[PDB]
């Protein structure tokens, strides 16, 4: 926050590291979610069927 | 010394050819400076690949 210092290249490419792992864990859980949780049109088509 | 820099042993026993730059036998106290004065950061644009 306050620091006057050098960031060393090690740090911020573990940094990187674990950002991009974490942007990586965000996109599979859209990618897992989207295929198995969200859907409207065939709900809305078996629903205006049944009604 | 080693390098321009200082490596204390922290090793409980004794060590032979172990470098310094080892971090279980070795302490590397970071210099203190002043920080008040302004120690220019030599940066070398080397474009670098993001895997060294």
């Known amino acids: 926050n306050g620091s006057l210092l050098v960031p060393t290249q090690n740090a911020v490419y573990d940094k990187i590291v674990t950002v991009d792992a974490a942007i990586a864990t965000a996109n599979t859980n859209i990618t897992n979610l989207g295929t198995a949780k969200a859907d409207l049109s065939y709900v809305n088509t078996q629903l205006s069927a049944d009604q | ?52």
């Open chain 2, 1 to 52: 010394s080693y390098f321009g820099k200082n490596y204390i042993s922290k090793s409980l026993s004794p060590i032979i050819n172990i470098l310094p730059t080892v971090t279980d036998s070795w302490y590397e106290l970071v210099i203190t400076l002043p920080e008040s004065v302004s120690v220019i950061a030599t940066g070398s644009d080397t474009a670098y690949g993001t895997g060294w």
